[PDB]
Design a protein around this ligand. Structure first.
Ligand SMILES: [Mg+2]
Ligand SMILES: [Mg+2]
Ligand SMILES: [Mg+2]
Lengths: 273, 283
């Protein structure tokens, strides 16, 4: 059973969320299997950011057991601003564990946008099916975005490929295109650009990419990548890896007893680009 | 000064919010002056529903001192559903006190009776408001919504404390600084009850946002309707509770009504059923 352990107050520099398996912290990057059901391409997704929130949360590659923390720049917590007509992040945003875009690639686990009705929670492990994939082309890095749905969603049986997103979620793909293009404009950065003219490739195409990034992670965790600088490969479930250490689980502090910190009211603001 | 008195937890049937002046409840409908500054057309707005929330919180016309309570259907808490690409309400939503959309006459702009409520206000400023807040706003324009076939004007307004307030003086300024907002507003009020099995709503003037001068004219009309109501002179007051603590010349004035309200019993927000998360795709 997967649960979460929160350190610190939410919306502070001290906030960290670890994934626990049967009460013991594990690595959110390395220890959660990519496949919940390999034969049927059912994936485990680690959720970072709930739909309609603003705090930029992500698995940190550089801390032991890779907790989810809030992104910072020059000591300040980072939030995405509200870009009309959107409210914060417009999907449940996360990543597939045991994947890595080898930059020898955007240097992170492959990104996943989960489109189901229920708002997710940070550190949630949910089971999803892949529907398709877009590519943001970012400063010479291919930043893939897998489009996925929770298998427990009421609509999941009716969605199998990317054309189904158009039928059941009309305009969601367009919103995704727009959102990714504009979401950094309030931060003083340029419009982003997509490959393939913003088109989403199909499931078959997504699976090939996901599989490549899994193979890259296999090389990484085996200690065989050309360059793993800045990545903590400590794990507690893979006994024949060089960086296996069960003791890392016990070194994690206990759950903090703290209410969410307030978010500055400036984050309410709606930007019209 | 205005504050709030909360009974119970948000998102429960027990939840009530009373507006207080000097720590004592007053009628949110009748006792808050329409104007904060009459000469400059600065209005008091009673906030009901913060931007990007769902709970359908309403000044309760039929309850003494008209606390804000969540509406229900078949005894269950009512929430407006998320209609793609929107998240809940896309404005800070509330009312002007001391106004009434008269349900006993057909209004000439729409050819329909009023919806029986105070005139509704969409406050477009950056900061998310809170339930029971009294804020001061300038009117910028107005839209002639027919909501389930009833005259249901929507005033477009901005909090006078918003950084942009000095730059927003008439409805054309809203399109300048908030491009696409008015179009989205038209859409939102057309579609927002489709997930509840109700028809699309409609607007007079093909959804045109009429200007400030138009808005002030209609606000005046609804204030005049309220003056008749509170005097006890409406042909049909629809069982509205006219108890008030500040209007000595009205038949229903009662300073004592304030003392009869229970003390605050504020609890943490209760959880909302996960179904309310759902995003509906209408077209
Ligand atoms: Mg990522
Ligand atoms: Mg990426
Ligand atoms: Mg109304």
């Amino acid at each position: 059973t997967y649960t979460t352990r929160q350190i610190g107050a939410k919306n502070t520099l001290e906030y960290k969320v670890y994934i626990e398996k049967d009460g013991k912290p594990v690595s959110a990057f390395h220890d959660i299997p990519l496949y919940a059901d390999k034969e049927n391409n059912i994936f485990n997704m680690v959720v970072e950011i709930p739909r309609w929130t603003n705090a930029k949360l992500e698995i940190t590659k550089e801390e032991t057991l890779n907790p989810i923390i809030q992104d910072t720049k020059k000591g300040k917590l980072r939030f995405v601003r509200n870009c009309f007509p959107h409210h914060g992040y417009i999907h449940n945003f996360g990543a597939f564990p045991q994947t890595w875009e080898d930059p020898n690639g955007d240097n992170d686990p492959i990104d996943v946008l989960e489109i189901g009705e229920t708002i997710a929670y940070t550190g949630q492990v949910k089971q999803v099916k892949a529907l398709g994939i877009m590519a943001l082309l970012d400063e010479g890095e291919t930043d893939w975005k897998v489009i996925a749905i929770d298998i427990n969603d009421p609509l999941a049986p009716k969605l199998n490929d990317i054309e189904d997103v158009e039928k059941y979620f009309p305009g969601l793909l367009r919103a995704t295109n727009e959102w990714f293009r504009i979401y950094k404009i309030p931060d003083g950065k340029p419009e982003n650009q997509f490959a393939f003219s913003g088109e989403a490739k199909n499931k078959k195409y997504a699976l090939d990419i996901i599989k490549e990034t899994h193979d890259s992670w296999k090389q990484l965790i085996a200690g065989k990548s050309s360059d793993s600088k800045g990545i903590d490969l400590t794990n507690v479930t893979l006994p024949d890896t060089p960086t296996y250490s069960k003791a890392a689980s016990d070194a994690i502090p206990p759950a903090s007893l703290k209410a969410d910190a307030p978010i500055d009211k400036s984050i309410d603001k709606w930007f019209f680009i």
